[PDB]
Amino acid sequence: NTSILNLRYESNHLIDLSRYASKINIGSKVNFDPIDKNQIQLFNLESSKIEVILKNAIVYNSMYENFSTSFWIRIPKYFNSISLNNEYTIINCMENNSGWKVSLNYGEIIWTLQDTQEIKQRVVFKYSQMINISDYINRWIFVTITNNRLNNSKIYINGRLIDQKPISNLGNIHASNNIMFKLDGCRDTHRYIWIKYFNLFDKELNEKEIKDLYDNQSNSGILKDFWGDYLQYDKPYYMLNLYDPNKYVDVNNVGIRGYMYLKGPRGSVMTTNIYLNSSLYRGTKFIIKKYNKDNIVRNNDRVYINVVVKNKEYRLATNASQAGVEKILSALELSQVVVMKSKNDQGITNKCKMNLQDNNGNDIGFIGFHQFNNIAKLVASNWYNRQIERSSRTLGCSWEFIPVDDGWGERPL
Amino acid sequence: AHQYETIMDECGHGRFQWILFFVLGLALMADGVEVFVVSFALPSAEKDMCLSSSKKGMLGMIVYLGMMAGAFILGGLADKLGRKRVLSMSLAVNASFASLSSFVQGYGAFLFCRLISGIGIGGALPIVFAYFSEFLSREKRGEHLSWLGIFWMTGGLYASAMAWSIIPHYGWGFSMGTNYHFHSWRVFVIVCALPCTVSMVALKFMPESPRFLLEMGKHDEAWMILKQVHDTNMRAKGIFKQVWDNALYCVMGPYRMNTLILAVVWFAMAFSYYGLTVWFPDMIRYFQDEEYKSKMKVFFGEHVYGATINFTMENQIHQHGKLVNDKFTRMYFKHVLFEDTFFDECYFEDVTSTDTYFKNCTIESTIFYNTDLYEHKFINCRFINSTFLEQKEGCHMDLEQDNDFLIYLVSFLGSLSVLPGNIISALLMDRIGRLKMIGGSMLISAVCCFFLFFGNSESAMIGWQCLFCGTSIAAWNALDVITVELYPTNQRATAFGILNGLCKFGAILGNTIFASFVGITKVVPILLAAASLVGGGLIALRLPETR
Ligand SMILES: *[C@@H]1O[C@H](CO[C@@H]2O[C@@H](C)[C@@H](O)[C@@H](O)[C@@H]2O)[C@@H](O[C@@H]2O[C@H](CO)[C@@H](O[C@@H]3O[C@H](CO[C@H]4O[C@H](CO)[C@@H](O)[C@H](O)[C@@H]4O)[C@@H](O)[C@H](O)[C@@H]3O)[C@H](O)[C@H]2NC(C)=O)[C@H](O)[C@H]1NC(C)=O
Ligand SMILES: *[C@@H]1O[C@H](CO[C@H]2O[C@@H](C)[C@@H](O)[C@@H](O)[C@@H]2O)[C@@H](O[C@@H]2O[C@H](CO)[C@@H](O)[C@H](O)[C@H]2NC(C)=O)[C@H](O)[C@H]1NC(C)=O
Ligand SMILES: *[C@@H]1O[C@H](CO)[C@@H](O)[C@H](O)[C@H]1NC(C)=O
């Protein structure tokens, strides 16, 4: 890592882990996530702000020194039309109209540089809110930005190059001595953001270094729900299947002879001239139950799965005596133990997956869907357990857990 | 001609002429069912399946134009080639292409098949009348021919009576995305080709025309058929250049004034009759629509709080409504309009809508689950935080309330009303004559038409339709007799064919003009029809006498 700015939260203290130990000032309206204190929530208030006083030797005042920044950010969906064409600073390091800022806009993240001669440059990243399933709306994204003072300035999203623009004409740049994590000029009153793992480096970032940082900060050892937070026990999660995002889970004839299938389409949630997405809060809710005293589910964990039907909890289970490799899944008031898989053989990861096992430890297989007759019934196949050998889209056990959240807008029925 | 007339007189009337009369009334029935299926089936098939306020599609009419060509192509040809062969070919092609039209996917191919079927059948009426005119006794000629006419009318009746039983659901034409079911139109098209099929079965036994055969030559064959007819009656009682010059010989020659007067009369009758016969059901539908539209409920400034709706509300408009925390579950929307209404967290479940339309509405925090309120039903509407769950697919309307059963029943009654009015013309045309009947019937129908302005009601409209149709059938019968009796046997088929083509042309004109002037005025089409009838019934006197 060996960063120059290493803002991290240790022992109810937000401090810079770097050797310089810059000063940190926290406002009174700065919320912190209880389950993970590194995730910081910022509101559109006067006191919802964080300030970093930098050392004199680390104040950027030069015309050739490359530098880079990196952070995880989560942006709740934009709702009302006032947010359009309204660009609000979220990270400010300008003094005398010289420095650098990170700002946002309707479906836009913008990195802006300005010199002492008022030459202004922007590198932007855009995502659409009119999409079936978005990988950037209300979900954690890893934004890193590198600046080489000779050729270009580039912005990468999730460890992948997204944009670059020239700054060669830029002159001397004198950034401010203070970093101001706050929303400025945000006309919408209720706008808030989530930010975590802000790191700064005094050198440009190569692609390999960025990918290493992404792998390190991803925290693959702990499973994640759809939004990218930490997966939790005893919490109702809706189901999503990545291979077919237009179809949701349902149960029929609760009991040993019953079966769960998938029916589509999911539906739609629409606000005219603002957004149009596929409805997520559909299907029978799943709950993960223990078999660590905390309610965070990590990798290589054996659990039970409960389906919530008519506010009654059934256990997920199956019999391995049925014909074929498929063991059509069922809900009961047997083979039920489910191992949670997040990391593959050595380093690969194919999202959160479930591996049904028997009572004696034999691997029944990964949980996916099969077209057994004209109804796509849930199965625990060992074909999926062998397909992952190519590290491709398994198109099976790739399931996403969707909890309820205020950053999405849709309300459950 | 004297010896042939004498031997035909000695042959008399018996079993054979009756059997032939039946096997020809079959073809006249086919003509009637063709007129019905073109004027009240196709026009009520292009109506939009998903609207209770759809207007008839006047696109099928082109088949009428095809009939025109048939009436000149298969009508004039027979006088140069033969009467049994031409009728056989015409009805055979009609039946075959109707059966082909039955097994057709798509509206365009079906309409083309109907057009060629009309081509085939439009040349049937002149051939059947010319055929039967060369077989019956000279003295007892007006009666039997007149009787044949009733079969024509019966055709429409039958074609109507079965139609409402099989396809009382409009929109079956402009819909090919449906399953292989809903094929009631397929079986209807199959069964409407029954009279022509039975006629094709029957015509193998009937012989050719004796007078025409004698005209061409081979007088021994004519003697053979005359002997066969006489024996049957005793046992019971105990080249297109030539055809075009032939057609010109029917108009711009010795037959000049008579053909002009006959064409004028045929056009006038086929204008007024084929206009009114379609005007009356349209007028009755407009009367019902007006009675509906009178009871329209206007709603202004509503505040509906926490209400669960379970019943059906129909024929309403809402303006500036504020529907807050409502719930529409398992209900029917019928002809109800929303304007400037502000919804709030309302819930729509299993709601089925027909002709409803949202306008300028602010719809907020709602759920549309299991509904057919598609996007096209929303006009300039702003959604807020809303959603659209799984929606039903299919055109769902209360078919029991919105169907074509007061358009087929009315046609049935209209065609039925002529049966008492035809017999009083059958056993009368040998007493009053052949020119006083047509003029008198035309003028009396005109007088009845001038009384229609007085009437405005369902019972009144159906009564006036029945009266007019009852007094406008003797005119048709006398017209058929006077147009088959004038020309010789070497020009009869051609002239009858051109007159039938002009009749179909007048049918097009009337069924367009009268059916278009609905809801704009009433005295204009009625005055026009009365003028046409009066002109025809004043000109028809200036005709040569035939008695
Ligand atoms: C469209 O929908 C968005 C968001 O979607 C909503 O999501 C949840 C919150 C439900 O309200 C659903 O019905 C909606 O679909 C709306 O934006 C939200 O508006 C609300 C109302 O102003 C905002 O709520 C704020 O919450 C603040 C914090 O509340 C604190 O206290 C409560 C207990 O009272 C506690 O539960 C909470 O955890 C906090 O501790 C509160 O101080 C403030 O006054 C306000 O009530 C919410 O923040 C908005 N979200 C966003 C992302 O902006 C839209 O209003 C709605 N309409 C339109 C036109 O967009
Ligand atoms: C569509 O309606 C808007 C607003 O009308 C709202 O009025 C509420 C009382 C309620 O009925 C709600 O359902 C409805 O939508 C019209 O805009 C308004 O227009 C007037 C006249 O110009 C202005 O004075 C208002 O400020 C303005 N308000 C808003 C919110 O825009 C709009 O004109 C109308 N459109 C049409 C063409 O019908
Ligand atoms: C009207 O609502 C009541 C209350 O739920 C219900 O019992 C009744 O069935 C509804 N009417 C109809 C016709 O379903």
Author numbering:
A (entry chain B): 875 to 1165, 1169 to 1210, 1217 to 1296
B (entry chain A): 92 to 329, 370 to 678
Paper text:
Botulinum neurotoxin A1 (BoNT/A1) belongs to the most potent toxins and is used as a major therapeutic agent. BoNTs and BoNT-like proteins share a common domain organization and are produced as precursors that are cleaved into a 50 kDa light chain (LC) and a 100 kDa heavy chain (HC) that with the exception of BoNT/Wo remain connected by a disulfide bond. The LC is a zinc metalloprotease that specifically cleaves soluble N-ethylmaleimide-sensitive-factor attachment receptor (SNARE) proteins. While the physiological functions of SV2 proteins remains to be determined, their best-established role is to act as receptors for several BoNTs (BoNT/A, /D, /E, and /F).
The resulting refined 3D reconstructions of SV2B-HCA1 and SV2B-BoNT/A1 complexes were obtained at 3.7 Å and 4 Å resolution, respectively. Our description of the SV2B structure is therefore based on the cryo-EM reconstruction of the SV2B-HCA1 complex, which features a very well resolved density for the complete TM region of SV2B. A substantial portion of the receptor spanning amino-acid residues D87 to Q345 and R362 to E679 could be resolved by cryo-EM, confirming that the N-terminus of the protein is unstructured. The overall SV2 fold consists of three parts: the LD, the transmembrane domain (TM) and the intracellular structure comprising four helices. The most prominent feature of SV2B is the unique and characteristic LD located between TM7 and TM8. The conserved cysteine in the LD region, C526, forms a disulfide bridge with C141 in the luminal loop 1 (LL1). In contrast, the experimentally determined cryo-EM structure is closed, with the entrance to the putative solute translocation pathway sealed by LL1. Superimposition of the SV2B-HCA1 and gSV2C-LD-HCA1 structures revealed similar protein-carbohydrate interactions. Both structures share a complex-type N-glycan that is linked to Asn-516 with two N-acetylglucosamines (NAG), two mannoses (BMA) and a fucose (FUC). The most prominent feature of the direct interaction of the glycan at N516 and HCA1 is a π-CH stacking interaction between F953 and the sugar ring of the first NAG. Among these, the most prominent is a network of salt bridges and hydrogen bonds involving E521 of SV2B and Y1122, K1137, and R1156 of BoNT/A1.
